[PDB]
mmCIF file of C-alpha atoms and ligand atoms in Angstrom:
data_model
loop_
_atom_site.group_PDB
_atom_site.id
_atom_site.type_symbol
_atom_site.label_atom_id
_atom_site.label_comp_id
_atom_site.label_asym_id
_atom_site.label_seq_id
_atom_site.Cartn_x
_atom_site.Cartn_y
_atom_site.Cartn_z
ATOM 1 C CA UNK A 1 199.995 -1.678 29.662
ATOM 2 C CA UNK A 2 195.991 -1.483 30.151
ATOM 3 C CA UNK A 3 193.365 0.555 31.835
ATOM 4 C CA UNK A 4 192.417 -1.650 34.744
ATOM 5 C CA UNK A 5 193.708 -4.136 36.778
ATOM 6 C CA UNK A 6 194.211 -5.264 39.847
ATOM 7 C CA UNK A 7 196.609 -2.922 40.682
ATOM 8 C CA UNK A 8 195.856 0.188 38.605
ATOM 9 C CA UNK A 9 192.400 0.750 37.114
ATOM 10 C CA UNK A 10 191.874 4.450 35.556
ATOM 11 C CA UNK A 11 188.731 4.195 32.617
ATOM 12 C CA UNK A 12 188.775 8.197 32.407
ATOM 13 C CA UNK A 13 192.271 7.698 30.862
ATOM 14 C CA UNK A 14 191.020 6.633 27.796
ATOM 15 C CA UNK A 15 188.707 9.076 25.882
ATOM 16 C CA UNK A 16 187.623 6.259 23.450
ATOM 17 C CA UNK A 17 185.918 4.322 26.202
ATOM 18 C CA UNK A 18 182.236 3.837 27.302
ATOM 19 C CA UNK A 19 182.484 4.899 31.143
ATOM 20 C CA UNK A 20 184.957 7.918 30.433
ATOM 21 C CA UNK A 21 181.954 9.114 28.253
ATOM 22 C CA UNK A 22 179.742 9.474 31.267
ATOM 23 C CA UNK A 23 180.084 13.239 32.079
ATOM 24 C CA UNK A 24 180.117 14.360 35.619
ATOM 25 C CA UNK A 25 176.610 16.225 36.860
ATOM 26 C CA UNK A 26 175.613 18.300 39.581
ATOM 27 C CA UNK A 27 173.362 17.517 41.920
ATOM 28 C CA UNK A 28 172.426 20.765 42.289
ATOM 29 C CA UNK A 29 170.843 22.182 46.056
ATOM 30 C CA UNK A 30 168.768 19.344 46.607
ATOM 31 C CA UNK A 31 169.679 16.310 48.485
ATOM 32 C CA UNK A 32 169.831 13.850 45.306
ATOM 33 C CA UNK A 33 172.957 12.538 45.561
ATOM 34 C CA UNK A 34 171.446 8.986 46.412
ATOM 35 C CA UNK A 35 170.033 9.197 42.787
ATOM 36 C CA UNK A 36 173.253 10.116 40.841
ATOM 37 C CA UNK A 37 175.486 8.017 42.344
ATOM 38 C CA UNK A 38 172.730 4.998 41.521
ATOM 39 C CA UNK A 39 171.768 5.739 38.536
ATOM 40 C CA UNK A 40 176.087 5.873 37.469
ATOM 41 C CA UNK A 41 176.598 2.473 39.102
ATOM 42 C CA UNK A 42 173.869 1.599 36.777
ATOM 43 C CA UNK A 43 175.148 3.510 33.514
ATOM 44 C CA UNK A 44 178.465 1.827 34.048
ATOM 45 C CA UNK A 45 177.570 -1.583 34.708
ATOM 46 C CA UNK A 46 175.475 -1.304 31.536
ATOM 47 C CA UNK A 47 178.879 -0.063 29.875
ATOM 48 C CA UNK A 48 180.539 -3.148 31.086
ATOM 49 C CA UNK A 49 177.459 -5.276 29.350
ATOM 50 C CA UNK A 50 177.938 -3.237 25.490
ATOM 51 C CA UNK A 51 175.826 -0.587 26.009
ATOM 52 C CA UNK A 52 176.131 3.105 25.139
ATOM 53 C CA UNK A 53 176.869 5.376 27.653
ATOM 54 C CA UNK A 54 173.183 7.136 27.699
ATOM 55 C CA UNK A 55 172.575 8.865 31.152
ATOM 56 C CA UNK A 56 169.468 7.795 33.052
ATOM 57 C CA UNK A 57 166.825 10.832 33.977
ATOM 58 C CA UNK A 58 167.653 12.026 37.589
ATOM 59 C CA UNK A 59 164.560 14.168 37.564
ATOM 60 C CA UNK A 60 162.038 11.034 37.119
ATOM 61 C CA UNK A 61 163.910 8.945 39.920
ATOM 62 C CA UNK A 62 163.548 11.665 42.321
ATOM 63 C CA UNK A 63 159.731 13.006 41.011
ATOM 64 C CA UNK A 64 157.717 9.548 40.430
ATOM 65 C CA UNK A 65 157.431 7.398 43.587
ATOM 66 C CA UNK A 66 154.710 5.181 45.301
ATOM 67 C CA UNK A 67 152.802 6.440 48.354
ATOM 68 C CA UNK A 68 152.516 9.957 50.129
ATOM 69 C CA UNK A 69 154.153 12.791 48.910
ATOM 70 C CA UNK A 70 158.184 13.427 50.102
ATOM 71 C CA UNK A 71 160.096 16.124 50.209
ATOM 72 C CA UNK A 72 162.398 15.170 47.973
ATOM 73 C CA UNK A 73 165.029 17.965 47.423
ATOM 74 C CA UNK A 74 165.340 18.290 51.368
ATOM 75 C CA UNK A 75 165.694 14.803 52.140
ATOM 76 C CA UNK A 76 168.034 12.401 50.601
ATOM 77 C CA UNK A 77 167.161 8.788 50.621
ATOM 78 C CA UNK A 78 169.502 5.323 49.852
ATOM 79 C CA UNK A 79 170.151 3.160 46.790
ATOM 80 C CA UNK A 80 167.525 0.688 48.243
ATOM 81 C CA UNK A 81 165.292 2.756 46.968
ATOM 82 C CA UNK A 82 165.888 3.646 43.763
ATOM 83 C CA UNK A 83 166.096 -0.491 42.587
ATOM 84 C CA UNK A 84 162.272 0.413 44.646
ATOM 85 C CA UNK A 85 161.562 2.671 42.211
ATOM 86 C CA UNK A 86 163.081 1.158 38.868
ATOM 87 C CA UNK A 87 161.018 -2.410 40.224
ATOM 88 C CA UNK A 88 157.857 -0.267 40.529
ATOM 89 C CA UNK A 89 157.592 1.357 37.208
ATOM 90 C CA UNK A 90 159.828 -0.706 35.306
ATOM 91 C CA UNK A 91 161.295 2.589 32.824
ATOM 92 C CA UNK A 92 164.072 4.418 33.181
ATOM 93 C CA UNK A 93 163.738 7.229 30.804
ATOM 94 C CA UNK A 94 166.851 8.922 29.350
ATOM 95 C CA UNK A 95 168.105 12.325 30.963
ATOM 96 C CA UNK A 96 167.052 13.677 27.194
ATOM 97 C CA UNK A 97 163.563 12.589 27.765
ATOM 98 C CA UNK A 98 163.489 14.138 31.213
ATOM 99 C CA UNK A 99 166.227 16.419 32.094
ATOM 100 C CA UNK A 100 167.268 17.624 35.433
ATOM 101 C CA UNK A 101 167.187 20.621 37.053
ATOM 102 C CA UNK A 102 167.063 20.896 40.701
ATOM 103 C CA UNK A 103 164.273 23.013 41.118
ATOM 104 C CA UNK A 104 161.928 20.959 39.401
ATOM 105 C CA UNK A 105 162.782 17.992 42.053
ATOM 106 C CA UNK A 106 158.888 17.512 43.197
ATOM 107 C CA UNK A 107 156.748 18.279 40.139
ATOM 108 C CA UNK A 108 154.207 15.906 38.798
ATOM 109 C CA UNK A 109 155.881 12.425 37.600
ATOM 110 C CA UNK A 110 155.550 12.806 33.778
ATOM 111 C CA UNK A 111 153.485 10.824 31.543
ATOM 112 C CA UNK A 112 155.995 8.513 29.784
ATOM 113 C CA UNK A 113 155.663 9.593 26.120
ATOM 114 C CA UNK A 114 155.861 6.744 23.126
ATOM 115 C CA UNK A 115 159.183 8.458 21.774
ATOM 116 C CA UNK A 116 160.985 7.941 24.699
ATOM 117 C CA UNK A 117 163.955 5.314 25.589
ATOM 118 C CA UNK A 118 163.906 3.023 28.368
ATOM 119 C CA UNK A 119 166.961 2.357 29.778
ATOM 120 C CA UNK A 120 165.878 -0.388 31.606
ATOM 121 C CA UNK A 121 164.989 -2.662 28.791
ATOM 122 C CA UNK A 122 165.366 -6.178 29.000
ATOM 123 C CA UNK A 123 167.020 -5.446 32.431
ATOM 124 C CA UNK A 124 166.119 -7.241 36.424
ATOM 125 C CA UNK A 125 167.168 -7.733 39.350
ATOM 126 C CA UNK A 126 168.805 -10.839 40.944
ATOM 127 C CA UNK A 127 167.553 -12.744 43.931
ATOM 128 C CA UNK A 128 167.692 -11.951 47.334
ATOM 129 C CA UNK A 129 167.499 -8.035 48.091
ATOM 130 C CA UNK A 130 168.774 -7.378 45.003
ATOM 131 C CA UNK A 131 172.437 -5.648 46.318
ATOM 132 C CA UNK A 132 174.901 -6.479 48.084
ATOM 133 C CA UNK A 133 176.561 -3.948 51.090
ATOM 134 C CA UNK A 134 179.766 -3.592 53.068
ATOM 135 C CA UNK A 135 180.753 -1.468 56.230
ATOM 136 C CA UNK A 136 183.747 -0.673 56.530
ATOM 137 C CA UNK A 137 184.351 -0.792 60.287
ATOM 138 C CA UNK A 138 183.229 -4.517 59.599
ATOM 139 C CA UNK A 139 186.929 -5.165 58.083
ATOM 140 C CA UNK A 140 188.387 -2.904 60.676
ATOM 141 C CA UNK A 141 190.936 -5.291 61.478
ATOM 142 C CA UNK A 142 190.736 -6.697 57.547
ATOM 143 C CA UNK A 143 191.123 -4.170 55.463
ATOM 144 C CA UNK A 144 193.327 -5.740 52.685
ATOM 145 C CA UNK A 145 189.366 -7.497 52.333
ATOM 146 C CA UNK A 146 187.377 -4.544 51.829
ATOM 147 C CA UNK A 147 189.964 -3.209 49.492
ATOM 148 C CA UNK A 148 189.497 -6.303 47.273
ATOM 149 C CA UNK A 149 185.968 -6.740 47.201
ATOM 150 C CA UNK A 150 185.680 -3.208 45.676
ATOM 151 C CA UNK A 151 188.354 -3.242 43.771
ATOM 152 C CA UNK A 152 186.621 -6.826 41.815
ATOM 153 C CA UNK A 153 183.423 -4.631 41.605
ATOM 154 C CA UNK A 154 184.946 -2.023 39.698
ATOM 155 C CA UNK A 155 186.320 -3.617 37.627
ATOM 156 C CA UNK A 156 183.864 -6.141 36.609
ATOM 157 C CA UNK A 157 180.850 -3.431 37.095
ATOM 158 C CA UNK A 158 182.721 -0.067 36.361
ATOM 159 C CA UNK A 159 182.078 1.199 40.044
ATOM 160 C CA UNK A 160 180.171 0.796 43.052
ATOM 161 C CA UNK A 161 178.201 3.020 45.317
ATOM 162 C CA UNK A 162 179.617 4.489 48.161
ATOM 163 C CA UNK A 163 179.036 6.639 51.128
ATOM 164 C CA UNK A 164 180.461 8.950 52.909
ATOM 165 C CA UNK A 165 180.115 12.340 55.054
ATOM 166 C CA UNK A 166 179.962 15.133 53.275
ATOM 167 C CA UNK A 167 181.932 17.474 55.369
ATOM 168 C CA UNK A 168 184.796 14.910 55.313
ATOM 169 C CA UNK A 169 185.913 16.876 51.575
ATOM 170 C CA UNK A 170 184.743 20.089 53.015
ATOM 171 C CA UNK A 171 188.144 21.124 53.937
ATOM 172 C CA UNK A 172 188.960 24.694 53.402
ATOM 173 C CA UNK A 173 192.302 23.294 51.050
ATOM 174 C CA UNK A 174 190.680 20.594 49.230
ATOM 175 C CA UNK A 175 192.107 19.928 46.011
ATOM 176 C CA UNK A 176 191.152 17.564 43.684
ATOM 177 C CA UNK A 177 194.644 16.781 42.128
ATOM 178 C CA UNK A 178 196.519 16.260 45.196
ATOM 179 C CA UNK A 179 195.861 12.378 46.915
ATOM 180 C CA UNK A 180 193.395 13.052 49.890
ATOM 181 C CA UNK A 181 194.250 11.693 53.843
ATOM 182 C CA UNK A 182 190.926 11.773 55.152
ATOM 183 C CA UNK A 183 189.185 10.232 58.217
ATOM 184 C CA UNK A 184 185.698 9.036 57.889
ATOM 185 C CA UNK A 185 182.841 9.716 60.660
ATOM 186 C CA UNK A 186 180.847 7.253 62.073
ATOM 187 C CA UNK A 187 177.855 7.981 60.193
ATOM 188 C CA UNK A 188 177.626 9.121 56.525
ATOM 189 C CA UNK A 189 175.139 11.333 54.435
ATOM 190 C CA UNK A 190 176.455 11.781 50.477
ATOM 191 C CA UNK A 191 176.639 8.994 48.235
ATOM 192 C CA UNK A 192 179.626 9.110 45.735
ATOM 193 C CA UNK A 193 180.699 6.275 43.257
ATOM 194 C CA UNK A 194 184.318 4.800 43.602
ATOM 195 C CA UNK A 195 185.299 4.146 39.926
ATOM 196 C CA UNK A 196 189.346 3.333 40.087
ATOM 197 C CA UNK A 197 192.497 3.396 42.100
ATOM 198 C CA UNK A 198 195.878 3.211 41.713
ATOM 199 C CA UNK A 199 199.563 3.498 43.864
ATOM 200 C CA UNK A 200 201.264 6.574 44.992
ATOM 201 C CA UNK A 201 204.341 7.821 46.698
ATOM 202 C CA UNK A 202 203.136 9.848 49.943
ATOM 203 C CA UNK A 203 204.372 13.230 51.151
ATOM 204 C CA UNK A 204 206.949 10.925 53.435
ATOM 205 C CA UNK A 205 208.084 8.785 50.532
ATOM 206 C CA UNK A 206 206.067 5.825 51.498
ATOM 207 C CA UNK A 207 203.920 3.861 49.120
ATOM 208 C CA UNK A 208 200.360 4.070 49.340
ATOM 209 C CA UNK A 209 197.249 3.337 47.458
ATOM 210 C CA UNK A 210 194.144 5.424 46.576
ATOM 211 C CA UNK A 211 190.533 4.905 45.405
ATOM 212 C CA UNK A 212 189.440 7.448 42.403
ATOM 213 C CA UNK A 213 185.882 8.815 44.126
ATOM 214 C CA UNK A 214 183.177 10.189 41.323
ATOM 215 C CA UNK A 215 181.418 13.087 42.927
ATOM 216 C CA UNK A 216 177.899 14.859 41.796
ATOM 217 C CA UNK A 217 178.758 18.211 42.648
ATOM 218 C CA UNK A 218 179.984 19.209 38.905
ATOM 219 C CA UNK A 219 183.025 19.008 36.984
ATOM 220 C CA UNK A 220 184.099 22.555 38.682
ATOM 221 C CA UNK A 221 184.069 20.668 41.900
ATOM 222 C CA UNK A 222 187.690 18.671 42.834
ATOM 223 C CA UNK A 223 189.051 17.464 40.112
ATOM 224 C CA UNK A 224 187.288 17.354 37.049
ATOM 225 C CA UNK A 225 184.119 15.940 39.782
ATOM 226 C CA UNK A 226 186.532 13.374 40.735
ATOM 227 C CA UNK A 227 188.507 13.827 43.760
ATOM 228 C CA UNK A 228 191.382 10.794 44.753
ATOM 229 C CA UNK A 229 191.274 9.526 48.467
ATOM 230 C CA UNK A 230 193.909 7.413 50.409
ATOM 231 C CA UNK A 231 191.809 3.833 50.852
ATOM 232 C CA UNK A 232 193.423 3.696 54.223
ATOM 233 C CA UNK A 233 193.958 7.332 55.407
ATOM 234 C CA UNK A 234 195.894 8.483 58.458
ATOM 235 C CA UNK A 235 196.626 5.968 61.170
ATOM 236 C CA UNK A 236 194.957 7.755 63.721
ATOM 237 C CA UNK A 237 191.495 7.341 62.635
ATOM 238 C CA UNK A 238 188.450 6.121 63.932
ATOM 239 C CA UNK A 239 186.853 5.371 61.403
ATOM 240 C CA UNK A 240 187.786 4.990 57.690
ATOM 241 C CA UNK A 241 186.704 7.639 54.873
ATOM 242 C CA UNK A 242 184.323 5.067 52.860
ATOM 243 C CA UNK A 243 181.615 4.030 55.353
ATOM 244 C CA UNK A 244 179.765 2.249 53.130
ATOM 245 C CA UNK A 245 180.141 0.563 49.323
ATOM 246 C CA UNK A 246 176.600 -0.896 47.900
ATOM 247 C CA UNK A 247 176.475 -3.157 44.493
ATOM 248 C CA UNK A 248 173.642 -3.526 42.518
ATOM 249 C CA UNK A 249 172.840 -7.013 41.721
ATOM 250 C CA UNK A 250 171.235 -7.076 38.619
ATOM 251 C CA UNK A 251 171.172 -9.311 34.982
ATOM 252 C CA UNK A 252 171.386 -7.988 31.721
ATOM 253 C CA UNK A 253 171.911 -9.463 28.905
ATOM 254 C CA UNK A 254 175.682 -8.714 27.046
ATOM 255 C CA UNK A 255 175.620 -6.462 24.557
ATOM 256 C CA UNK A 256 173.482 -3.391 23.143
HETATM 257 CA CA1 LIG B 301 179.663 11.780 63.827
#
């Protein structure tokens, strides 16, 4: 054989299936990334629960907000604050209903309009934050840990959020085809979605494992979006690629 288990879990391999329906996006040249790789986890874990695979507006996350104007194409923010935003007007409109275009990040939230889907129906959040986060450098020393906890989340959820540094796949030879060995910094600044994984034979014939990482940089970008990293990476590093996976805690009803 199937699609995902513990030890292999690949959705995009199978054309007929809810998450491989979700199309990769681009974020554009605003810092947004906080909203696609939310507003996936969201889309996927509303896959898992019988839904169709409608994409969530973008533009009205990052446009209608409480309090003083942001600069919201300069300034990314977290996945805390999206559930902040989703709490506080309680509609998710559908990317048809509002689509996204980067330069458009900061006009007047719209007036939701009688025709239009909410994609947030029926849905809330579980006490008590609401999500649940890891660090990575917290399971320095118990990695095989980390590795499980996400891998449970993807597959009961379809993903989890994740962050990492942007210049980390900035390398002059990336390619999205070829297993990545890549060190992580201390901090991070691009949130990505982890959505599968699977084992590999390494350049030196040894077994390995990798996450598949979602990116929101277009399907141009790596590989089809999608880029494959090694979940433990070269020995030498400090710190590990992932820096930080988040999981939305939320309850919706099964099927739609
Ligand atoms: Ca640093």
């Amino acid at each position: 054989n199937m699609f995902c288990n513990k030890e292999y879990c690949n959705r995009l391999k199978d054309e007929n299936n809810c998450i491989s329906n979700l199309q990769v996006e681009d974020q554009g040249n605003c810092d947004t990334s906080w909203i696609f790789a939310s507003k996936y986890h969201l889309e996927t874990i509303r896959c898992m629960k019988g839904y169709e695979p409608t994409k969530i507006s973008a533009l009205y996350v990052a446009n209608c907000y409480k309090g003083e104007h942001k600069d919201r194409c300069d300034e990314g923010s977290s996945p805390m604050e999206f559930l902040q935003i989703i709490e506080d007007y309680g509609f998710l409109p559908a990317e048809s209903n509002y689509p996204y275009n980067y330069v458009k990040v900061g006009e007047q939230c719209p007036k939701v309009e009688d025709h239009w889907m909410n994609l947030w129906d029926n849905g809330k959040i579980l006490h008590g934050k609401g999500y649940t986060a890891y660090e990575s450098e917290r399971f320095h020393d118990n990695m095989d840990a980390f590795v499980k906890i996400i891998k449970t989340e993807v597959m009961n959820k379809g993903s989890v959020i994740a962050y990492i540094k942007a210049e980390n796949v900035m390398g002059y030879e990336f390619s999205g085809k070829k297993v990545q060995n890549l060190c992580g910094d201390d901090t991070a600044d691009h949130a990505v979605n982890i959505v599968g994984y699977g084992n590999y034979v390494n350049s030196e014939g040894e077994k390995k494992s990798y996450w598949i990482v979602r990116n929101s940089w277009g399907p141009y970008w790596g590989d089809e979006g999608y880029f494959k990293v090694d979940m433990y990476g070269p020995t030498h590093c400090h710190f590990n690629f992932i820096h930080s996976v988040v999981i939305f805690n939320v309850d919706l009803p099964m099927n739609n």
